[PDB]
Symmetry: D2
Subunit: 159 residues, 4 copies
């Protein structure tokens, strides 16, 4: 389950796919990670790989799907968390991504790598709140400048 035969042929197709991947032929790499998945539908690495192949051809919905599956299959396959983080950044969901970089930083406490990624990301989350504030600042200046104070009137009636 699969027979040792589906397991061995799935491992060949995966290699075939890798070749195609390293040679920039994504269409074929995706085609072959898929066959390997048909035969060994529970191998997290295949999904991790195909997810990346999907990130390289800008298919962010597919990559996210493949990334979540990898994590459903092996809760402790780190790259699944990197593939999902990458898919969510591409989809613009930066805080969802930060959640995954955090997870990795927690299990690889001294991996300078994890730290770097999570930093880049927390940064991008803060620059977003930044660009938004400025725009709100820029807009306020324009409203205030356009305020019709001149047409306002003093109470010209007894008091």
């Amino acid at each position: 389950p699969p027979a040792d035969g589906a397991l061995k042929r799935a491992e060949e197709l995966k290699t075939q796919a890798n070749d195609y991947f390293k040679a920039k032929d994504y269409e074929n790499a995706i085609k072959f990670y898929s066959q390997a998945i048909e035969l060994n539908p529970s191998n997290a690495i295949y999904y991790g790989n195909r997810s990346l192949a999907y990130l390289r051809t800008e298919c962010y919905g597919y990559a996210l799907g493949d990334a979540t599956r990898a994590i459903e299959l092996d809760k402790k396959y780190i790259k699944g968390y990197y593939r999902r983080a990458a898919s969510n950044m591409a989809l613009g969901k930066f805080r969802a991504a930060l959640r995954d970089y955090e997870t990795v930083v927690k299990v690889k406490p001294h991996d300078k790598d994890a730290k770097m990624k999570y930093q880049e990301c927390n940064k991008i989350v803060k620059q977003k709140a930044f660009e938004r504030a400025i725009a709100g600042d820029e807009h306020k200046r324009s409203v205030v400048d356009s305020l019709d104070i001149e047409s306002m009137t003093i109470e010209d009636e007894y008091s």
Copy 2:
């Protein structure tokens, strides 16, 4: 309380101030609404007027203060609500202003005036959420374009 004498002189100074106001001499209009206030410290109209005099010389903190006082004194002096709305727009607190335009629209249901102001304002509240979204959209496009997918790696280890 005040003596009929403080009441009558307060009404003269108020007029003196109005003159100065209509003649664009804000420094003096403020000087005289103040004297009228010293003598009749509970007249809402004086505060309403001085608030406006403060909006005309860009003193938004003073105008807001004078506007809140007018409303503390006569809960149903409409202009106090317009002075406070105007002060909060200038201070960039658009939703606080909208709250006041709403109040006026509720008591003057058919005053096309109230409707117009409240419309301008709800609009400015929506344009703000707009400019902010765009900026967030613009920033996302730039993050996604800069995402280092190329340095990501396929699992090059047995699986």
Copy 3:
């Protein structure tokens, strides 16, 4: 391309899938829309259907991918726009969804249906800005209440 033979068998598998779909067997419906896609990889309806099958089993990344493909294949297959809108709502990207409901409302101007969907959506976009404002209001009240004004000091030095 495909041979009339792949075209006819793809249309059977699609039906097989539909059966499985209407009988709530999503795992099998997905399995069969896929075979139909292997044989007729350019049929937008198959993708539209599989996308929905993906929305029903909560696989929002896959559904979005299948929805974008349907739109790449037939720019004027409306449901593709509904599948993509639905996938983006589920993914929390409400404004991206609104963009698609708008497109449909523009080509089906009198379809009360299009209007209804786009209304639900513009509403959800406005309720989001709402819940966010309140939370910001609630937080401000708490900061202001906690402000240490009492420890502030008057200038106790000559002036």
Copy 4:
């Protein structure tokens, strides 16, 4: 300008006010900082003090006005920047306040005090973006849970 006489009496009234301030009698402290201001209208400390007296009685618009004036009069009277920061926090304009705490931190680089205030504030700016995100997260969960996927339909027409 003023005559040495207005200068000396203004300094007495200021003291009178301080007494009233330290004895929690704000109404009178405000009354006397005002007289001192009438006689020496250009003394920044009087404004700084009255601003605080205004923060203590919750008159945030007046305090902000008095704080800006103090800064117009003596660009390097630090407390003016603390009074304005305090008025803007109370008014909910946290980032405007942060701007002032930054200014002070820049001229008093080693004043642990400046650092502490600016920290409290940058924190409050970040907790606000926080409470807002959560609310947006909470709302998304509810939309997604309410999404009518069940009424969606597979294409039941030839393809």
